[PDB]
Copies of this chain bind each other. A is one copy, B any other.
Amino acid sequence: TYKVAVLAGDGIGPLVMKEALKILTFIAQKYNFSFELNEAKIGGASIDAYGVALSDETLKLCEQSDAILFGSVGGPKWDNLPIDQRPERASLLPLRKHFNLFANLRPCKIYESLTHASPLKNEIIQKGVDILCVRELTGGIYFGKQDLGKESAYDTEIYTKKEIERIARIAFESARIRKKKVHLIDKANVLASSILWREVVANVAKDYQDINLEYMYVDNAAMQIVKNPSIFDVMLCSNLFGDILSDELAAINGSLGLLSSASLNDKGFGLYEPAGGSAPDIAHLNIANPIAQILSAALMLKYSFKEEQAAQDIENAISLALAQGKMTKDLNAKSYLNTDEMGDCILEILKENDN
């Protein structure tokens, strides 16, 4: 059994989660493995029931699971609580800390059928953009010693070998099952901490002689994402640099509703969620794009459960659905499918290819 804590949350979360569960249920059937999918409240849902955004019983469920499939949290009903009790701050941050989720993986794949929605000219991306941004979450400038004075202020970009090594291993493991290339993004021509990155990564790379390792400065990487992004496979970044480039990658993608995120530790545990936010203003309708949630469930199969073919099947189903013109309102305003119709479309493609 693969034990999944399903925390769908608020607003569109339960509605899009229903579609991901539909797809995973089929996948477990096809591959003859079992899911235990324990749904539990998180966020606003949990504040209503239990008075807090993350209950002890829900935390313990997560500890007993192999991964967390997370929806979205937050909405107007709870916007008036004390800041520290509000759904998002009180759910995701403590989970990341509890489970030492030090690595964020955000794919940037541009689907041939949605090339028009990228802000980049079609000729720039025509070879195919398929990138994975791997960002360290625990180290560097966001956590180093800092001081605000009246006349002077500083912050400290500090990293350890332990921090670099564990994120580097995540990146190479990804590259192994993608296109076998890692670009280490740094500023080694001036930063001592970037020099340490290169030393540690080059040493980790000895275990991964099948992977092509390249180094690129963060300023050149900001250029290349605009000028020639098809070269990238895995992009390994520090916390600060990843925070910047992951947004740039989102921007070149063009289809925000398809973007997913995995926050992983070093033991195969992850929290998998759509990149986008709540969408309270469409929560009562049946139009939200479920593809990001479904793609989060694929990432969970690939990275927490090592069910690579199952993941691939889901991804190929989405590619084919989009290639057939089957899309939600955010992707095609003139001709679209409702959330449940989109889920069913994907399911049917999975069944059509199950021979």
In the bound complex, do residue A153 and residue B193 qualify as a contact, i.e. CB atoms below 8 Å apart? yes
Classify chain A: how many residues form its interface, as a range.
35 or more
| Contact residues in B for A28 (Cβ distance below 8 Å) | none
Tell yes or no: A156 within 8 A of B by CB: yes
The stretch among A94-102, A119-127, A287-295, A319-327 that forms the contact with chain B is A119-127
In the bound complex, do residue B148 and residue A153 qualify as a contact, i.e. CB atoms below 8 Å apart? no
In the bound complex, do residue A156 and residue B153 qualify as a contact, i.e. CB atoms below 8 Å apart? no
148-170 of chain A: CB within 8 A of chain B = 148-162
Contact with A121, one of B121, B248, B250 (Cβ below 8 angstroms): B121
In the bound complex, do residue A148 and residue B195 qualify as a contact, i.e. CB atoms below 8 Å apart? yes
Q: Report the minimum CB–CB distance from A42 to chain B (whole Å).
A: 23
The stretch among A66-74, A215-223, A309-317 that forms the contact with chain B is A215-223
In the bound complex, do residue B141 and residue A152 qualify as a contact, i.e. CB atoms below 8 Å apart? no
Q: How many copies does the complex hold?
A: 2
Contact with A152, one of B154, B158, B240, B247 (Cβ below 8 angstroms): B158
Q: Report the minimum CB–CB distance from A1 to chain B (whole Å).
A: 39
In the bound complex, do residue A244 and residue B219 qualify as a contact, i.e. CB atoms below 8 Å apart? yes
Q: Mark A83-125, 1 if CB is under 8 A from B, else 0.
A: 0000000000000000000000000000000000011110010
The closest CB in chain B to the CB of A253 belongs to: B226
Contact with A193, one of B154, B247, B250 (Cβ below 8 angstroms): B154
Tell yes or no: A227 within 8 A of B by CB: yes
Tell yes or no: A268 within 8 A of B by CB: no
**Can you give 26 A-B contacts (C-beta < 8 A)?**
A118-B121, A119-B227, A141-B157, A141-B191, A142-B190, A144-B154, A146-B191, A146-B192, A146-B193, A147-B192, A148-B192, A152-B159, A153-B158, A153-B159, A154-B159, A154-B192, A154-B193, A155-B157, A155-B192, A155-B193, A156-B157, A219-B246, A219-B247, A222-B244, A222-B247, A223-B247
What is A's interface to B at a CB cutoff of 8 Å? Answer: 118-121, 124, 141-142, 144, 146-162, 187, 190-193, 195-196, 218-220, 222-224, 226-227, 240, 243-248, 250-252
Ranked nearest first, the 8 interchain pairs of A and B with the lowest CB-CB distance are A153-B196, A226-B251, A154-B158, A223-B251, A148-B192, A146-B192, A222-B248, A219-B247
